[PDB]
Structure 1
């Protein structure tokens, strides 16, 4: 059976993938250790992270300048990259250039991990949440403003099963299994969805949801995106670059339904530094927001304040998308992998390359060329 990409993830200037055979690979900026190869050099093409061979990794997730992965059979979570503020979770601030297990999470059944700039969170199979890293604006949800170098349980969610979490620069969001939406952390751009510009040190429930329950949530750097059980898309927070997608640059302090997509059912979402991607159930990918480096993928370098469909060869359907700070990655139905946007750190994975403003196939990871 031909080797394929199982999971992709984009960080600020790097890219990580999990391949069949439980193989982790990475490419892009390596200076802070985020690629995991033991050295500090950029890799312009996918490079196997051999130290994780045989660890049966089942998922990978990038933060801005660090990476996390976990194994079910090993009951282990691993982290590597820039170590400041405790974002790696090991009880110190050391950078790591090679993956190390987060001892505090050993033997815990992991459901999902989210990574922001300087903090991370893990959701357990029982719907509990642990968080770690920078906490200067309450983004850990622990009720104070002191950084945590190790994971701590978010006690505020006692009795509340969490389905998934999301993390931006310095804020955090979550949805419950029953459909409630929460926000906490740095809130100055309205990005918590609470109708104001004030931080929260513990999770606070978003009450203005258009009467709808939310099935998923994702964070860009200072904006937030959610999807309801009817497949409607909502955005809130920072609007400067059109990343909210409402056809203007208006601020939103509560979730605002994106009307242009109302006839579609959104199945996946991703928030970048200053851009946004949404995938429909029919496999159409839409992008919007900042496009200086071509990261929206629509064949130009003009910013886009309304969703525009990203096009692929033969109109192949998209199945996964992940936004970096200046680039975007996607996987299609044909098991092809594409990248676009900024390429100066090698993050596009296509060897030495100029920036790209529409999707470019990553030959190393694809069936086609």
Structure 2
């Protein structure tokens, strides 16, 4: 086909799939098996990017991954789905009955995904805190795990499934193919070919784009639109969300108590953005991608400039004190808590991709060097044996990755994951020489 189609799955592949198989690196805190570096106690806290030996580039051949709150999914060349992390509510989609099976990356049985036998492939993975999703090249969505809420388990699908332990076909909810996923903490967004957005999961923070009264929370626990149309790109923080329209207008909704939605100078406790609201951005800026955590958001332009907004308590926004703008929110005690409008970061390289976990972030410079900042106590920034928060984007330099071209990054609650390829000796020396001279 129809004339309503504005999106194709191909439009997103550069963001998600690497052409080359990747060395996978993991770091931060893995007390709940998040690091996927196996069962040993020494390997549940890792302060610098560590090459993951369970995902060797020449055999596992990982080409994509999606990092959730407490678990990760990865995709290989033959479209097998690998998982590791916390399986307490089925998120790994495989039998795991640190726990060795949970802390060791392994494949979900191929039979668990019927489209694979038909020659279809996964084009995107998505992981929330407690749920997992795979989008297939034929528009089908497989999902597993559950959604939690403030007080416990909400459920998985309507009042029919509480916890889904194996991949499960989500009943069709559009006349168009699904083209993109955006996972939050306990909700997930879907985008279809015509630009309609659907939301599924917990809704206590208005993340579903509609108010849901208590007694309808299970009756309506399935992907549903909410009047948001003409969208070409979706992204999600934990409890807030972003949509970019065909006409280059960026809107946000959901949790906004730190101004993470970037819509207003006014910062107020318990604030929720109910109807999607436009972010003001200079006319110059074309949006490439967005990453968001619990209380901050990161907006990357096509030119490589990064705009941040939201919380400042753990340096989430990565703006140094002596450059905080005049619209910085200060509380009654005079402490700067938030930067509620998107604010361009200065004195940084141009970035090509960005990822955000709960209170930390990792961005990749055009030259393939990763930069991190934010909350430091769990070492998710991978900057070594220092607990203090990192104020501005800071180069990750360690033996394991110093000569790698970093291609993909992702972040969870207390940890981060990257994928890269070794530079040739020639290219590695050239980049090293370039970086040393500045």
Q: In which range does the TM-score fall when normalised by the shorter chain?
A: 0.7 to 0.9
Question: Does the C-alpha gap of structure 1 residues 136 and 328 become closer, same or farther in structure 2, counting only changes over 3 Å?
Answer: closer
Q: What is the match of residue 279 of structure 2?
A: 258
Structure 1: runs of 5 or more not aligned: 1-6, 10-17
Match runs of 1:268-287 below 5 Å:
268-287=289-308
Counterpart of 1:37 in 2: which secondary structure?
coil
Whole-Å separation in 1 of the counterparts to 2:96 and 2:53:
25
Partner of 2:73 in structure 1?
Answer: 68
Matched residues, number: 349
When normalised by structure 2's length, the TM-score is 0.74
Which residue does 2:160 correspond to in 1? 144
Task: State the alpha-carbon separation in 1 of the partners of residues 391 and 298 from structure 2.
Answer: 15
Kept in 1: contact 2:258–2:337 (CA 8 A)? no
Paired residues for 1:62-211 under 5 Å: 62-73=67-78, 75-91=79-95, 96-103=102-109, 104-105=112-113, 107=116, 109-135=121-147, 140-141=156-157, 144-157=160-173, 159-194=175-210, 199=217, 200-207=220-227, 209=228
CA contact 1:43–1:345 (8 Å) conserved in 2: no
Q: Is the 8 A contact 1:85 1:147 kept in 2?
A: yes
Residues 230-256 of structure 1, C-alpha deviations (whole Å, 9 max, x = no match):
222111011111111112245321211
Q: Please say if residues 277 and 285 of structure 1, whose CA atoms lie closer than 8 Å, have aligned partners that are also in contact.
A: yes
Conservation of the 8 A alpha-carbon contact between 2:250 and 2:278: yes
Shift of 1:22: 1.9
SS at match of 2:223: strand
Structure with higher strand content = 1
Structure showing greater radius of gyration is 2
Q: CA deviation at 1:177?
A: 1.9
Deviation at 1:161, TM superposition (A): 0.5
Q: Is the 8 A contact 1:319 1:331 kept in 2?
A: yes
Work out which of the residue numbers 344, 351, 358 in structure 1 matches 2:384: 351
Q: Does 2:81 match 1:46?
A: no
CA distance in 1, matches of 2:259, 2:395: 27
When the two structures are superposed, what TM-score results if normalisation uses the length of structure 1? 0.87
Contact 1:232 1:262 in 2 (8 A): no
